[PDB]
Amino acid sequence: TLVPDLTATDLARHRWLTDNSWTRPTWTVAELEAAKAGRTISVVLPALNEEETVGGVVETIRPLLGGLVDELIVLDSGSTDDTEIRAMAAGARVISREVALPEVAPQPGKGEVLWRSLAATTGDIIVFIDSDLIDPDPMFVPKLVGPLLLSEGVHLVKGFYRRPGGGRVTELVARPLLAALRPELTCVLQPLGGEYAGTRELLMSVPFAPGYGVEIGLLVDTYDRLGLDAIAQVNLGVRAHRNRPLTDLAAMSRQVIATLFSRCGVPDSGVGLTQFFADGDGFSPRTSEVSLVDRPPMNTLRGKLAAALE
Amino acid sequence: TLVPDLTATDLARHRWLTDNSWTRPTWTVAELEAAKAGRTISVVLPALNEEETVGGVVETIRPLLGGLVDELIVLDSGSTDDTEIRAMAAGARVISREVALPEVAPQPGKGEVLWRSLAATTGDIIVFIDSDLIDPDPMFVPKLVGPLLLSEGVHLVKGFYRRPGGGRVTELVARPLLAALRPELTCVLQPLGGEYAGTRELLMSVPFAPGYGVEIGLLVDTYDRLGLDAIAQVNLGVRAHRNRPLTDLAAMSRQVIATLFSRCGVPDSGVGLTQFFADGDGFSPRTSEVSLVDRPPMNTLRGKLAAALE
Ligand SMILES: O=c1ccn([C@@H]2O[C@H](COP(=O)(O)OP(=O)(O)O[C@H]3O[C@H](CO)[C@@H](O)[C@H](O)[C@H]3O)[C@@H](O)[C@H]2O)c(=O)[nH]1
Ligand SMILES: O=c1ccn([C@@H]2O[C@H](COP(=O)(O)OP(=O)(O)O[C@H]3O[C@H](CO)[C@@H](O)[C@H](O)[C@H]3O)[C@@H](O)[C@H]2O)c(=O)[nH]1
Ligand SMILES: [Cl-]
Ligand SMILES: [Cl-]
Ligand SMILES: [Cl-]
Ligand SMILES: [Cl-]
Numbered sequence A, B: 001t002l003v004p005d006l007t008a009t010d011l012a013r014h015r016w017l018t019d020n021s022w023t024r025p026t027w028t029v030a031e032l033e034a035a036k037a038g039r040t041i042s043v044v045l046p047a048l049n050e051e052e053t054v055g056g057v058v059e060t061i062r063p064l065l066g067g068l069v070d071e072l073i074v075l076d077s078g079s080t081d082d083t084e085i086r087a088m089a090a091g092a093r094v095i096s097r098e099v100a101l102p103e104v105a106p107q108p109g110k111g112e113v114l115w116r117s118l119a120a121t122t123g124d125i126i127v128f129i130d131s132d133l134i135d136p137d138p139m140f141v142p143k144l145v146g147p148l149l150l151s152e153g154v155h156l157v158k159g160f161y162r163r164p165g166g167g168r169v170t171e172l173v174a175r176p177l178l179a180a181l182r183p184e185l186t187c188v189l190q191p192l193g194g195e196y197a198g199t200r201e202l203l204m205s206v207p208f209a210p211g212y213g214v215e216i217g218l219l220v221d222t223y224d225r226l227g228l229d230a231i232a233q234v235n236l237g238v239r240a241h242r243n244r245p246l247t248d249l250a251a252m253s254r255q256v257i258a259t260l261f262s263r264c265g266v267p268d269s270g271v272g273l274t275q276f277f278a279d280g281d282g283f284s285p286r287t288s289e290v291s292l293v294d295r296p297p298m299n300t301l302r303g304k305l306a307a308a309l310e
């Protein structure tokens, strides 16, 4: 809706950029573990055919297990390569989508994986880390849980990277649409980032958007329910953006739009994106589908599950 | 709104892709001029500081003047370089925004220029060609007016280019948002293209979006008023996309979104886009503004102007 009271200049100097944004986090693992105060921490790595990188990501996190980190799980998304055994050989516990929630048949896409991981974990804090990262840094998890353990009233922490400019979908799609529909959320540098942490109570009580909608849906639902102050962001360091083909990004953009529209009361047509390429006197069409149906809050399945929710 | 009856596969094979889309136009200038049937044609080149290219674009069109083309105008957008004299030396008539409509003070942006050119031209058909093109082809104008002169019921023709993949704002922003909000318009390959033609009656009767919103606003207003059949597209040939910085494209995307939202009943916040860059412990913010106010249909000023509307 129309917000004539707010300007981009206002947003450029928002107090949130000072109080809830850490460009140089200096927390130590020891003071984070001392601040757990009985809360447990689960780290979840979604993985669809990431045999080349999953072990490297796991090993950056494995030394924390039994100290800061209580559970280290790779949620296997139906991989056909060697993802599972390499994750196990690197020290992670691996759980398939079926084992995570056997009563419900798996759907494709990343949101399904993160949603199912709620039923597979027990931590009061859940940290999500992508398993395709080529150069993961071992301070990812400590930085992501810092604001949850050492600030007040934070329930969602987004990890951003400094650019040595950035992601095309982030800068052209997600952030301009957030300026139009949820302008305070443009304070978040990288709303589509895959490295973030949330408290279980929050995550059990929001729907999970399907496919690549999941990050932006969680950000907007958190903002709508709890306000900007409940969100924080932390600099995870320098990561160069790797190249993805424009055609993949366009299908992903379509789903980001559908998920944002469904959270913001915008009636999305539900129609997938067609992409055309030259042929002769006609085109070579390429289509993708979009989903407008969330997985409901995991709390709604409570008491119906053979493995009980924590 | 929700369109469960339409699918991307339906759109990939839409009859419109056959009847209103020309990948190999073979009209001759002679048969186009014979089909004018008393209609006149005005060619308008908006130009803001294009001294290096404007003359080259004009010269590709100048041989048509007095035959197919009745008026060849560069609408000078407040240039401070040598745009005006180079356009004149290349054979164009040059009209400033002030001279085009002296009763109204100029606003910045491309939409203002195209809107004012309606008052400066007399043609029954108006062709818009960007003045920054490095390699303009002399068949642009003939191809753009072909469907207007030789088809039935066409009022807007969009020129597209084959890629020797494409524009980032087009593929990630405009076309996925059109899939969500006006899915039939995803049949248009390049909705943000600057080379297009329209009939005067249509163009005098729609508002003109400001800045870079103007192309997408004209496309959606034409579709809403007249249907997909009233729109056509023609292959202008091979043009490689030149590189523009991501930060420019993000501000442009924000305005494309605001204009699309204003045509589709989506309440846009009106808040401009902030972009952040690393500094030290803080950021270097960069802001841009967005406009939600159109210029009204030029027909509404009819009879109030010292130079009468055609
Ligand atoms: O069905 C799926 C798809 C992906 N993944 C995993 O999820 C991660 C991210 O998937 P990827 O295709 O690499 O996403 P990106 O292209 O990097 O997309 C960016 O933007 C998306 C939209 O917010 C986020 O979900 C991503 O984490 C973020 O990196 C990887 O570990 C994948 O193996 C699954 O487990 N299952
Ligand atoms: O205030 C302005 C801005 C631009 N122009 C002229 O308009 C043309 C296009 O401007 P440019 O900044 O080069 O646009 P693009 O980055 O190429 O934007 C693409 O996408 C836009 C959104 O639809 C279209 O308006 C453009 O024509 C299209 O080329 C050029 O001849 C400019 O000189 C003006 O006359 N006045
Ligand atoms: Cl390995
Ligand atoms: Cl599946
Ligand atoms: Cl991105
Ligand atoms: Cl010159």
Ligand SMILES: [Cl-]
Pocket: B078, B106, B107, B108, B109
């Ligand atoms: Cl101006």
Ligand SMILES: [Cl-]
Pocket: B166, B167, B168, B169, B170, B171, B192
């Ligand atoms: Cl583009």
Ligand SMILES: [Mg+2]
Pocket: A130, A132
């Ligand atoms: Mg990735």
Ligand SMILES: [Mg+2]
Pocket: B130, B132
């Ligand atoms: Mg240009």
